Design a protein around this ligand. Structure first.
Ligand code: ABF
Ligand code: ABF
Lengths: 168, 212
């Protein structure tokens, strides 16, 4: 049973409509892309979804990130960080995200599969992704934050002009 | 009676605009009290549809939280409150209550004396979970030392399920709140520990005790 991602990049557990997870108690691997991945293997995900991906990744023993070279960064944050939020909490969460140093932007006209909204947070230079993940997860009204930092990639396969580079 | 202790604290909270209003049997008494102020307040922000309906019945205007960018006070009950003013809530609207409490400057906990505990955890801790994550989150709550029990036949206002976690002696509520909030699939945990109560009004046979 393999954990399978979403996006352009026995059976399986799948992260998008494009086994149900409750039917398994473990997954060997989860293979998925990312919007950004840093030198510490920490990622921003959710540009496309977010909650399903992070839950499946939490069950997999090994996260195998697959991406073209453009996704590699030194400091996470140029790509806006997605935060899924309970609708009634949108302005409250936005205020706290400003306090943490970001500029939250409501993703207009989009709802998640859970009926929530997304705030994409611009302008952060996320120097300590675990601390930032923890700070955003502390905010009442946050469902999921697209920082995969406490649980990042275990292996990354990067598509370069020269071939596939494997970073463990 | 226990209900008269609840009534004492609900009314004592009037001592403390747009008012943040909680939910449950103790909060219900505070709403009665607030009704006596129908012509004096601007209105309220409510943590549940039941509270909204009661407020409206007493002529109090109910604003959505998104209509304010700040709240002076939030008055609500709790299932447990410890000596550090940290609470377990959610036995009954957990997500809405925690979001409103995050906006309010002053959280006033109203409770009868039975809610005071030295160590949180005898009352099972509610955890609201995305349905597809139920089993995964339960495995992690076991690893953290709890016994998660699916609250059968209940769904939250957000369409999620609740795991009530039994058997924890929560010696460090902030650490535990942070550990549960870290779990993918957790929406909200009913530990109010990073943001606890600022004032507690405890109803006792000797009168209402105020703890700040
Ligand atoms: O590989 P792509 O098309 O760049 O898509 C990446 C996106 O698909 C998912 O993995 C997401 O988390 C993410 O945002
Ligand atoms: O005052 P009561 O009736 O004990 O009700 C307490 C409950 O109502 C709400 O505050 C909840 O968070 C909580 O579980």
């Amino acid at each position: 049973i393999v954990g399978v991602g979403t996006g352009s990049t026995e059976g399986a557990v799948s992260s998008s409509d494009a086994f149900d997870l409750n039917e398994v108690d473990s997954l060997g691997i989860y293979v998925d892309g990312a919007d950004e991945i840093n030198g510490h293997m920490q990622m921003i995900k959710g540009g496309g979804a977010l909650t399903r991906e992070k839950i499946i990744a939490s069950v997999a023993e090994k996260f195998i990130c697959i991406a073209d070279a453009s996704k590699q960064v030194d400091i996470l944050g140029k790509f806006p960080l997605p935060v899924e939020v309970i609708p009634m909490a949108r302005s409250a969460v936005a205020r706290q995200l400003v306090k943490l140093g970001g500029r939250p932007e409501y993703r207009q006209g989009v709802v998640t599969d859970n009926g929530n909204v997304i705030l994409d947070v611009h302008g952060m230079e996320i120097l300590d992704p675990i601390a930032m993940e923890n700070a955003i997860n502390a905010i009442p009204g946050v469902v999921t934050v697209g920082l995969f930092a406490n649980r990042g990639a275990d292996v990354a396969l990067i598509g370069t002009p020269d071939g596939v580079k494997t970073i463990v």
